[PDB]
TrEMBL record, chain A:
Assembly notes: Interacts with capsid protein VP1 and capsid protein VP3 to form heterotrimeric protomers.
Protein name per the record: Genome polyprotein
Role played: Component of immature procapsids, which is cleaved into capsid proteins VP4 and VP2 after maturation. Allows the capsid to remain inactive before the maturation step. Lies on the inner surface of the capsid shell. After binding to the host receptor, the capsid undergoes conformational changes. Capsid protein VP4 is released, Capsid protein VP1 N-terminus is externalized, and together, they shape a pore in the host membrane through which the viral genome is translocated into the host cell cytoplasm.
Family (UniProt): Belongs to the picornaviruses polyprotein family.
Cell location: Host cytoplasm; Virion
Superkingdom classification of source: Viruses
Picornavirus capsid domain location: 9-201
Segment of the intact protein contained: 85 to 319 of 862
Automatic annotation (TrEMBL), chains B, D:
GO BP term, pick one: symbiont entry into host cell
Name used for this protein in its record: Genome polyprotein
Organism name: Human enterovirus 71
Chief place of localization: host cell
Subcellular location, record wording: Host cytoplasm; Virion
Domain Picornavirus capsid VP1 positions: 1-194
GO cellular component: host cell; virion component
Assigned keywords, A-Z: Capsid protein, Host cytoplasm, Host-virus interaction, Lipoprotein, Myristate, T=pseudo3 icosahedral capsid protein, Viral attachment to host cell, Virion, Virus entry into host cell
From TrEMBL, chains C, E:
Any GO molecular function: structural molecule activity
Residue window of the full protein shown: 324 to 559 of 862
The Picornavirus capsid domain, residue ranges: 29-183
Function: Component of immature procapsids, which is cleaved into capsid proteins VP4 and VP2 after maturation. Allows the capsid to remain inactive before the maturation step.
Protein name: Genome polyprotein
Organism annotation: Human enterovirus 71
Lineage: Viruses, Riboviria, Orthornavirae, Pisuviricota, Pisoniviricetes
Family the UniProt entry places it in: Belongs to the picornaviruses polyprotein family.
Length: 227, 225, 221, 225, 221, 56
């Protein structure tokens, strides 16, 4: 199904848990391409280091340059699709760790006021599109958002416990303020990751832990309109 | 629970407190033109915005009453009538503007000896509901690379202001003291978000400084009891 | 002695307060209502009225007054550019200030609805050719090439059918798309025929126009 | 449409705005007799007549309230009572006229400390409804070649005026400031006509000058984008 | 002339008076209500949210910010004392000021409800041992010996079961009992294993939380 | 206006007022020492009102 040497999937007996009985569905109230959308491509591998604090990406800003359908969609502002996110950590019996993963809607970006004079300049053009490089955190209490880390529990969240299982999947519903709204003008959501256990191991173990991000649209779309 | 009659939600939200204060100096330097305009800026004060910031989607009408008196509490027989300009029309800048001659704007006049005034205004904003947060670019124009000429002053988000004048051939010779109380009529919220813990540095931005703070340090040491 | 509570806000003057008073003379009878076969109750009647829109606002001379209402077209120009309609916004300046709806919006803020355009061809009886009018959907920028125009919705305009062609824009609000008109092909005629013609355009709105918020704004003066 | 509850016609017409202004100079030269008469002339002001001129056939009653104050907004305890003369009877010219002694004219007296006054008057014009346009000769007489002696002053079309006097043996020593608001109660129209686009030159005639105007010239040239 | 009695207290301004006024414009229609499949009506949704509580409020350095969220445990200490939770009172200072309910109580006086604690074990795969967490009931003073701790309610915590263990305090109001945590046994590992581990704790409240009296108190600033 | 009629609810955290108390009024776990705020205990009354004058 995938042209190459990687057709990795996450079994067939996953444990999907519904939330408040409002699983995503089709809104077709009043108040064909289905061949090339069902194929999933695996993103490139990334090396996790000891000093890494985390990463964040803007959606669907990353897919504008990556996906084949991303390029011609730059002038077609419409887009509507749900996503299924699978997280797994490949580790042996000599590694310890815990992971906290959650989604924060309208991840606002706050500026900083440092130095003897509290005045900030405009962001540069190069940092406007960081690509795969991303950014680096300066004050991790706020995560560049002014929010204490401990209080994020108000949003959907999951705890990664390595005692019994290793791979977990979380499902979130698509939310919008208007029945029809622009996608390239309003940010949809973002991803946040925070390290809980610092990387500790003895000599002879693997000092690198792979980081896997899996994208798979669990709810198929029709789409196709002028928006 | 067993009985929920005394636990009624009525007392959970209803609280009247001082929010605004408008002064009318008889001479001054900050306001030497003798007239001032006060737009309804909820975000102006930190103490009130803390309660409001727990809410994300809301649309509601407003009810205000105006009281004027002296610092000694004595009452005086002075009458005022209030005129409102829709937010769509621009606010006046100079005295010779046409906003004072507009007859199409409705007005309601009440006295002071009567029971306290109760007035309500509808939701006239072109949007569906107010938005306190916006993860993007506030302007709703097709241009996405330049900036509007009226940057900084964007009355397109607020709900307008009121104009105050004195009845009589000559100008009034007494300054007044006025306090305003604010309340919500309907309470409906959808997406719950956390509030703020540290203080605010700028009025329109939540940015912080390099001197971090800690919620509490009461425990001298955690090792001991 | 009946107890009564005095609510706050007694001497306030309210602009939107609707009040009724008893007539001074209860004996005089007003004139009877006049019965007419045709009856009209609602303001919707104005929404189906056609208004002409013009672009050539350049001339201001007195003796050029009548030519304003049209725009000329000539065969001398070859594959150039006919007319450049500005951003469709009744609130903003442009061709829309003359229309009835734009004046109606002068006390108002948010509008939404559908747009339709109609074109009829008034050329010579022997001429042959093809015209095409297309509206670029939102997102797409101004058309640099005809290829970018064809991806949007286009309608074929034959010279055998005059005005039955209808184009509908599904939804416009307040950012949006743009419309441009190029020369699909040059109008050519043989000897013994006029070298100049004129084109008439139409613009209207559908039933789905609504209003939400009133504004205390007056554009006069 | 789907729901038309919020789109109610109530907000489409109801708007209160300043229309009139009456001054009472304590001495003057324009009005040295100490009394003035103000007929209800809707056509007097251009800004209000623009809204009205969209309507052709209408008949309705009127509701007015009167407020008086000082330029500084201070209130004073002064009482007035208002007397109305039917349009059929001629208006007074000199102080020694009999219009002030007429007891047959009804009057209503209210105070100021009470809630605001609400008064209504019936349609007393002998015609069926008001006519803003008349494609002919306004006089309704059998003579069609000469002109009436009272040409220019034709109170037969308006709805009369009010007389104001001060209670007390001596004349009042304070001038007052009064503003008036106007509204419609019933809205019914039959024949729709266009409004005006250019300005007015005379008060009673729509005539224009030789300096023509253009609705807009924003586009520098139509040839370019 | 209708007789009416004037009740005392006419010009008084009442803060808790709920009033309604007629709209100025009865014609404008507000925007229609938006229909969403999932609907939430009550504030109870916040009562089931989990919040972390921390004790090591000693460090204040900038470069020690991330380690605050946990508390370390080491095998060097032998049968000492792990953590000393202060008196459970959201109104008073301590770990409870960060929680949502404690902030909510800042305008309020009397509270009552049940408390639950959850613990999960994150040790090595080969380690063996037994942990025990017990809450001393009211009346009993701080535990000087483990014998005084055992008379109170205790729950066995095996390492084969991670988090299904639930402890419930029947009733807390505002004087009360105390909770203490000792080292049940020292965590020992052989060669080739880490000498340090971390423990995660949970705290929540039951449905039986209620409020009685409102207070005009503001903790900010 | 007619005389003012105002009502306030029962906001005390207790169930009802108690004029007599055959014991120690403080409701704290400490039963041998005394609170720092001894003598001034507003925890039993129902609060007070603030009066100011309107005017510069």
């Amino acid at each position: 199904l995938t042209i190459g040497n990687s057709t990795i999937t996450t079994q067939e007996a996953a444990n999907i848990i519904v939330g408040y009985g409002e699983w995503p569905s089709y809104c077709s109230d009043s108040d064909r391409p289905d061949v090339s959308v069902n194929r999933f491509y695996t993103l490139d591998t990334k090396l996790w280091e000891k000093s890494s604090k985390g990463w964040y990406w803007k959606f669907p800003d990353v897919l504008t340059e990556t996906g084949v359908f991303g390029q011609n969609a730059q002038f077609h502002y419409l887009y509507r699709s749900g996503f299924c996110i699978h997280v797994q950590c490949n580790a042996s019996k000599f590694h310890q760790g815990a992971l906290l993963v959650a989604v924060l809607p309208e991840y606002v970006i706050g500026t900083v006021a440092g130095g003897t004079g509290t005045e900030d300049s405009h962001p540069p053009y190069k940092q406007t599109q960081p690509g795969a490089d991303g950014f680096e955190l300066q004050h991790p209490y706020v995560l560049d958002a002014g929010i204490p880390i401990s209080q994020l529990t108000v949003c959907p969240h999951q705890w990664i416990n390595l005692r019994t299982n290793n791979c977990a999947t979380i499902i979130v519903p698509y939310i919008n303020a208007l029945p029809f709204d622009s996608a390239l003008n309003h940010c949809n959501f973002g991803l946040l990751v925070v390290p809980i256990s610092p990387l500790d191991y003895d000599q002879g173990a693997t000092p690198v832990i792979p980081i896997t991000i899996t994208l798979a649209p669990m709810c198929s779309e029709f789409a196709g309109l002028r928006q | 629970s067993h009985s929920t009659a005394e636990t009624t939600l009525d007392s959970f939200f209803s609280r009247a407190g001082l929010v605004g204060e408008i002064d009318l100096p008889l001479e001054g330097t900050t306001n030497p033109n003798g007239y001032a305009n006060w737009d309804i800026d909820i975000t102006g004060y930190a103490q009130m915005r803390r309660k409001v910031e727990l809410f994300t989607y809301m649309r509601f009408d407003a009810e205000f009453t105006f009281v004027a008196c002296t610092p000694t509490g004595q009452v005086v027989p002075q009458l005022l009538q209030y005129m409102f300009v829709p937010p769509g029309a621009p606010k006046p800048d100079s005295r010779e503007s046409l906003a004072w001659q507009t007859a199409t704007n409705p007005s309601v006049f009440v006295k002071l000896s009567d029971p306290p005034a109760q007035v309500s205004v509808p939701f006239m904003s072109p949007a569906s509901a107010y938005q306190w947060f916006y993860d993007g670019y506030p302007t709703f124009g097709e241009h996405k690379q330049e900036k509007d000429l009226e940057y900084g002053a964007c009355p397109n988000n607020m709900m307008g202001t009121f104009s105050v004048r004195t009845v009589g051939t000559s100008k009034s010779k007494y300054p007044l003291v006025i306090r305003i109380y604010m309340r919500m009529k309907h309470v409906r919220a959808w997406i719950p978000r956390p509030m703020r813990n540290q203080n605010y540095l700028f009025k329109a931005n939540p940015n912080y400084a390099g001197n971090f703070i800690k919620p509490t340090g009461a425990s001298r040491t955690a090792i001991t009891t | 002695g009946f107890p009564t509570e005095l609510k706050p806000g007694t001497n306030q003057f309210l602009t939107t307060d609707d009040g009724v008073s008893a007539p001074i003379l209860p004996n005089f009878h007003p004139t009877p209502c006049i019965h007419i076969p045709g009856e009209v109750r609602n303001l919707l009647e104005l929404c189906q009225v056609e208004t002409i829109l013009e672009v050539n606002n350049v001339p201001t001379n007195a003796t050029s007054l009548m030519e304003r209402l049209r725009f000329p077209v000539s065969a001398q120009a070859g594959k150039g550019e006919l007319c450049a309609v500005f951003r469709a916004d009744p609130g903003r300046s442009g061709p829309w200030q003359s229309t009835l709806l734009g004046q109606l919006c002068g006390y108002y803020t948010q509008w939404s609805g559908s747009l339709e355009v109609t074109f009829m061809f008034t050329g010579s009886f022997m001429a042959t050719g093809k015209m095409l009018i297309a509206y670029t959907p939102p997102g797409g920028p101004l058309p640099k090439d005809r290829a970018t125009a064809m991806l949007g919705t286009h309608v074929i305009w034959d010279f055998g059918l005059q005005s039955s062609v209808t184009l509908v824009i599904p939804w416009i609000s307040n950012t949006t798309g743009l419309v441009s008109i190029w020369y699909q092909t040059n109008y050519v005629v043989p000897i013994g025929a006029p070298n100049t013609a004129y084109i008439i355009a139409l613009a209207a709105a559908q039933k789905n126009f609504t209003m939400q918020l009133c504004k205390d704004a007056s554009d006069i003066l």
